[PDB]
Design a protein around this ligand. Sequence first.
Ligand SMILES: CC(C)(C)NC(=O)[C@@H]1CN(Cc2cccnc2)CCN1C[C@@H](O)C[C@@H](Cc1ccccc1)C(=O)N[C@H]1c2ccccc2C[C@H]1O
Lengths: 99, 99
Amino acid sequence: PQITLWKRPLVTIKIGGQLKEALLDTGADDTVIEEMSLPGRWKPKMIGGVGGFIKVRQYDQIIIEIAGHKAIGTVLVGPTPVNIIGRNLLTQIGATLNF
Amino acid sequence: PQITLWKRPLVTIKIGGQLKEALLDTGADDTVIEEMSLPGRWKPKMIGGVGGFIKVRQYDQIIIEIAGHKAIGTVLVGPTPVNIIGRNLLTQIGATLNF
Ligand SMILES: CC(C)(C)NC(=O)[C@@H]1CN(Cc2cccnc2)CCN1C[C@@H](O)C[C@@H](Cc1ccccc1)C(=O)N[C@H]1c2ccccc2C[C@H]1O
């Protein structure tokens, strides 16, 4: 679709078989989802944004559906304030900014 | 224009008579610019990022040019790691996310 920005660009995702709401975030390098049980091995990671750094679980090669579009890639899991779809997966689904 | 997301979507902005580089950020509600001595009045604000909150100065009705497109709105100034153009100004320049 084409998504305007008057409201947060929230979409439904499917991850681990579960539906969640997430924010399409062009300012995020990576994808980070709130704490959940997720099938795969993981390793510790830290990511930083405004306000500082958080500790996350890094899961590689995770199947995720974003507004009906398939991606398979790195998903971080940890105490993010909101679920965030970042550029690593926005690129997979062919998302661009236009003006 | 169209901007892909293989790298951070950085553009040139003009604010306060100065050129800066800034990130077009659909995940950001607000626009946050690195410390700069903008004139006049401002209001204290705290804004929340992925890692917690930071202190900023809120300036209203600020003239800013984003990739050649003029606009006007609220700009938050403080110790941000990157200059961030958020939805309050992305809407003004008619930006969308497309896939
Ligand atoms: C107005 C303000 C700027 C404070 N907003 C944000 O920071 C929001 C906060 N919400 C949360 C919120 C908090 C409170 C209230 N409402 C919402 C989550 C989404 N972010 C938007 C992010 O796109 C901001 C960027 C900024 C940044 C870019 C590059 C380098 C440093 C900082 C961000 O945090 N990106 C980082 C990022 C993000 C996810 C995964 C990995 C990484 C690395 C890095 O790219």
